[PDB]
Design a binder for this molecule. Structure first.
Ligand SMILES: NC(=O)c1ccc[n+]([C@@H]2O[C@H](COP(=O)([O-])OP(=O)(O)OC[C@H]3O[C@@H](n4cnc5c(N)ncnc54)[C@H](O)[C@@H]3O)[C@@H](O)[C@H]2O)c1
Ligand SMILES: NC(=O)c1ccc[n+]([C@@H]2O[C@H](COP(=O)([O-])OP(=O)(O)OC[C@H]3O[C@@H](n4cnc5c(N)ncnc54)[C@H](O)[C@@H]3O)[C@@H](O)[C@H]2O)c1
Lengths: 314, 312, 314, 312
C-alpha cells in the first residue's frame, strides 16, 4: 500500500457488488478484497469480476478474503447489515445492526487495520457514529455516505434546469439521510447567482418547479423500490465517488456523514453536512450560515438522530 | 453533430450490468432500455439514473419500446429464454430462436438500421439467426463470440511472461463453448513467439501454458456453479465491443463473424479475429493456422453448422 | 464534420504552437490545421507535432493549410497579429491588428467557414469585437479568451488558500483583459460560504492575503516576461480549455470575452464576464449582482474598451 | 503514500516541451526544473505554473538546483552543447561528455538514488557515459533510444494495413541514427506477419513499406531543415518513457539499454525492445533476428563501441 490503493468491502449483496463493479469500471482502486460469510455468492462475484478484468481501464486485483485481509487496506467499506422489515421501527432495526457492526468493527480493528471506514448500511448516520465508538479511530477517519446521493441528484436536477454545468451549480441537501433532510436554498447559487434572485428576475424560473424538485429528490428511492424491488445502482455510484475523493486526495466537498461538535448548533452526532474529503478522511467542515427556517429544520434533523442514539449510547 | 445511441433489449443480469458498465465508462451518449417486463425495465432505468450525477460522462438513459430503436446506432440483444432445469432439451435453442424472431421483427419494423450486437447463448447460433431474421449485411450483425475468453487468455499471459497486455498477442477462436481453441501458433510475447520462450526457458514450462487454457474455457462454468449466472464479465466484453464500434477504433476482436470460406468454412458465424469499427466488421484477419488448429477449427465450425440447418 | 471535430489555427508562433501541443496532449480535437505565411516555421511545427502523434492519448491529424482549409472547421482560433512595441499605444497597436484581422476574417468567411471564432490576439476584447463586425456572425459565435486565465489562477490561489477543491471554490475576475480587470469579491465563496464571512469568523484568513493574491494575479504576465522574455504556456492552456468546452458541449462557465448589450449597465462592447460555453458558443450570460464598488470598476473597464473602439467603429 | 517526482535538467526547447507535456498529460506529481541559465528556468516554471488551474491533474512545478534531486524518482537530462557552426567537429561529443560529467556528479552528490533518463544526442553514447559517471546499476540508466522512430513506424503501419496501432507490432532497433534498422522479421499485423501480407496481396507491396522506413529515419532531419530543431516529438517520447516508469507499466519500449552479449553485442548501450517499469529496465526482449538483421545490428553496435573506446 505505498504505491497502491486497496479497498476492503464487507458485504457482497446488491450494493456491495455494484460498488465493486463501479470501482473496477472507473479505475478507482488498485486492489479490492471482498469479505462475506456467504462464500458461494461472494466467491462467485469475485470470480465474475475477475473474468472481465482485461477490459477495465486499469488492472484491478480482486479477491475473496476475511478480516485479516484488511490489515493493509486504505479503506474499509461496510455494506453488511440486516434490512428494514415492514412494521419494524428504525430503533428495532438499529438494535440488530449494532450487534452486527460490533462484531465487524471489532474484527477489523484486530487485523491491524489503520485506514478510513466508509459506512453504507442503513440508518447510515447512526451506524457511522457506532463505527466511530466501536473503532476508537479519530472522528475524521470514520465517514458515512450521508446525503451525498440526494445532494448530487438535487445539484444535477437544478443544473439541467438553469442550464449550466454541475461544476458551476451550488446546491446542498443536508441533515439526516432520510425524510428530515433539507435543501439549503439560502446558499443555492447558479454560476454564483443566488437561486432566489434567478427566480424573482424570471417567471421561466418559479419556486414550485423547485419545491417539487425537492420532493422528488426525497422520494426517488421509494419509487425505484416500488417498481423494481430494491435500489442499489445509485448508492454504489455515490460510494465510488466518495472512495475516489479519498484514494486520490481530491479535497472534494461532499455531504458525507460527519461528526459535529457544536457546529450548526448540533452536538455529538454524525450527520450530513458539506465536508472536504481527502486521503486523510475529513479535512474540514464547511459551515454554511443557515437562515432561520433551515436552522430549525437542521436541529430537528439532528434531533431525530440523537433520539435513536440515546437508548444505545451514553 | 452525431449523437451515439444504444438500444438495449433485455434488462436482466447481463443487460442491466451492461448498462451500468456503459454509464460508468462514458461510452455512449444515449441509452434506451427495452424489456417485455416493462416494470423491471422502468425500475432499472430509474436506478441507473439515480446516480447519474456521478457518471464521468453525461449519458441520457431512458425506458423505451421497440419503436425507439429507429435511430439507434447499435441494438444490443441480451434477452433470452429461461432454463426449465428439467427439459435439458439440448436444443431449447428453439425457445430462443422464437424470441429472436419476434424481437428482430419489431426492431426492423421501427426503421432501425444500425448494427446488431448479440450476447445471448448460444451466441454463434443466435448471431447467424439475427442476420437471417433481419436481412442486414453480414458486417452489421455481430456476436460477442470468444472476445471475453481471448481477453482473459491474453492478459493471463502478460502476467506469466511479465509484459503489458498491450504487448502480448494471443487469440481464442472457434465456437464460443466447448469446441473453442487457442491459437498457439501465433501467440507471442513482445515480438517473440511463445514456443521460442517455452524451449529457451524452464521458468516457462510448457504444461503451465496448457492449464491456463483450461481455466479460460471453464471460467464461466465455475462462476455459474457458485453464483447461478455470469454477468459482470460478459457485460464488460459487450461494453468493449460497443466502444470499438461507437468510437471507430478499428481494433481487432474475436467476435462472432460471418465466414466466406476464409478459414475453410463458410455460411457460418464463428469466433475469429475481425477488425471492428463504426461500420461494424471492416475486415477478417487471416491467421496461418497450423494443421492441428485447422483440424480443431473446422471441427468446431462443423459442430455449429450442424445445429443450424435443422432450423435453416 | 459529423463524427469529428476540426480546429483551424491561424498563427503559428509561441502561443499558437503551444496551443496546438496542448490540444494534442489533452486529446481535445480530432483534427487540426495550421495556417501561417511563414511556411518553413509552420510546416516545421506541423511536422514536429506529427512526429510524436503515436504517443498522444488520441490519434490527431495535423496539417499545414490555408484559409480554404477552414471550410469544415468547427473552430477557427486566431493567434496572429503584430505585437505591442515599447512606447507604442494600444490604439496604435489596434490600428495594425485591425488591418490584419480584416484580411484574416474576410478570407475565412469566403472559404465557407460556419463555426465558432476563438480570438487570442491582444487587445483580445477589441479584436473579438472586430471579428464580430468583420464576420457578420451571430455574437454568440465569436468568443475571446477574456479574463479566463486570470480568473482561473485567481480561483486556484484561493483553492489552495482555504483548502477546498477548485470545483467548490467560486471566484471571478471580470472586465477588460488587463489592468482594469476586477475581482468580484461580493460573490467569491468557498463551498457556498462567502469569502467575507470566512475572513471575519477566522484570522488565519486576513484581508491583505486576499488583496495581494489579486495584485499578483494582475502582474503574473509581467513577471514571466521579465525572466523569460515572453509568456505563452498559460495562454495556450486557457485556449485549450475554452476549445474543450466548445468541442465537447460542456456548458462550462468561463469568463470569456462576450458581447454585452445592457447587462451590467454596459452597451455594445465585448468584455470578460462569466458565460456558459457550449457547442453552439455562448449559451447564456451569468449576471452577477455587483455591489456599488464593483459596478463602478466594471463600467470604467467597459469604458476604456469603448474609448478604443470608438475611433474605429460607429 | 508515495509522491512521484521528476527532476529535469535543461530547460531548452526539449526540456520545456517535456515539462509542458507532463503537465498536460498529468503524468507526475512534482517536477523540478534545473538550468545553468537560472533566469530561463525561473521564467519557464512561472509560465508553466501560469496555466496550472487548467491542468487535468495537480502538478507541483518548481525551480530548483541540483540538491533538489535527492528525492527525485527520475532525473531527465535534456541539457547539452550548442552546435558551433565552426568546426563541424564530428566530435563535440567531447563538448557534451564534459557537460554530463559535471551534471551527473552534481546529482549523485545530492543523494539521488533513482533512475536517469537521457535525451541529449548522441543518445546512445551519452547513456553509456551517464552509467559510467553515476555508478548506478545499468537498469537504472535509460536512453530515449529509438522509441520515437519505432512508434512512428508502428503507427504508419496501422494506417497502411488498417488496424489500431494497439495490435500492430513493429520495432526499430540499433543506434539512434543512420545505422538504425527495421526488424521486418517480426513485424506483424493482428498476429499475421508482414511478409505474409505483402506477397498474399498487391494492395500491399515491399517498396511501399520500404519508403515508410526512410521517412522514419529522415523525419528529424527534415524537421531540422525547416524549423531549426525538433522538440515536440522528442518531448512526447520522453513523457511516454517517464509514464512507463512512474506508473509501473511493464511497457515494451526500444529504449537505449545495456547489452550483455544479448544480440551479439556487449558493453554497449543501444536500442532494443526492453520491458520498462518502476524499477527501470526489467527485461530485454530477445528477437530472433534473421541474418540480414544480425549483420545490420552488429554493424550498428560496432559503430557505437568504436566512438566509445577513445573515452573508455
Ligand atoms: N450466465 C448467464 O447469465 C446465463 C446462463 C445461461 C443462459 N443464459 C441466456 O442468456 C440470457 C441472458 O442472461 P441473463 O442472466 O441476463 O437472463 P435474465 O433472466 O436475468 O434476463 C433475461 C431478460 O430478457 C427478457 N426478455 C425475455 N424475452 C424477451 C422479449 N421477447 N423481448 C424483450 N425482452 C425479453 C426478460 O424479461 C429478462 O429480463 C438468458 O435469458 C438465457 O437465455 C444466461
Ligand atoms: N533537435 C534538437 O533539439 C537538437 C539538435 C541538435 C543537437 N541537440 C542537442 O540536444 C541538446 C538539447 O536540445 P535543445 O534543442 O533543447 O537545446 P537548447 O539549446 O534549446 O537547450 C539546451 C539547454 O541545456 C542547458 N544547459 C547547458 N549546459 C547545462 C548544464 N551544465 N547544466 C544544466 N543545464 C545546461 C542550456 O542552458 C539550455 O537551456 C542541445 O543542447 C544539443 O546538444 C538538439
Amino acid at each position: 500500500n505505498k504505491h497502491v490503493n486497496k479497498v476492503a468491502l464487507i458485504g457482497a449483496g446488491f450494493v456491495g457488488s455494484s460498488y465493486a463493479f463501479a470501482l473496477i469500471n472507473q479505475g478507482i482502486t488498485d486492489e479490492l478484497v471482498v469479505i462475506d460469510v456467504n462464500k458461494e455468492k461472494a466467491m462467485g462475484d469475485v470470480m465474475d469480476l475477475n473474468h472481465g478484468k482485461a477490459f477495465a481501464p486499469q488492472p484491478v486485483k480482486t479477491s475473496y478474503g476475511t478480516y485479516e485481509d484488511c490489515k493493509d487496506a486504505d479503506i474499509v467499506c461496510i455494506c453488511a447489515g440486516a434490512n428494514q422489515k415492514p412494521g419494524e421501527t428504525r430503533l428495532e432495526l438499529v438494535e440488530k445492526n449494532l450487534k452486527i457492526f460490533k462484531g465487524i468493527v471489532s474484527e477489523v480493528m484486530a487485523s491491524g487495520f489503520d485506514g478510513i471506514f466508509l459506512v453504507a448500511t442503513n440508518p447510515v448516520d447512526i451506524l457511522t457514529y457506532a463505527t466511530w465508538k466501536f473503532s476508537g479511530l479519530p472522528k475524521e477517519r470514520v465517514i458515512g455516505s450521508g446525503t451525498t446521493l440526494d445532494s448530487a441528484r438535487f445539484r444535477f436536477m437544478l443544473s439541467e434546469y438553469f442550464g449550466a454545468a454541475p461544476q458551476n451549480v451550488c446546491a446542498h441537501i443536508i441533515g439526516e439521510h432520510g425524510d428530515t433532510e433539507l435543501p439549503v436554498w439560502s446558499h443555492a447559487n447558479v454560476g454564483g447567482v443566488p437561486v432566489s434572485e434567478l427566480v424573482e428576475k424570471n417567471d421561466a424560473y418559479k419556486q414550485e418547479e423547485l419545491d417539487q424538485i425537492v420532493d422528488d429528490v426525497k422520494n426517488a428511492a421509494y419509487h425505484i423500490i416500488e417498481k423494481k424491488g430494491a435500489t442499489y445502482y445509485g448508492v454504489a455510484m455515490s460510494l465510488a465517488r466518495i472512495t475516489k475523493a479519498i484514494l486520490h486526495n481530491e479535497n472534494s466537498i461532499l455531504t458525507v456523514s460527519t461528526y459535529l461538535d457544536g457546529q450548526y448548533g448540533a452536538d455529538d452526532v454524525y450527520i450530513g453536512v458539506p465536508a472536504v474529503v481527502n486521503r486523510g478522511g475529513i479535512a474540514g467542515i464547511t459551515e454554511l450560515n443557515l437562515n432561520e427556517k433551515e436552522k430549525e429544520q437542521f436541529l430537528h434533523s439532528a434531533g431525530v438522530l440523537k433520539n435513536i442514539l440515546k437508548p444505545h449510547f451514553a
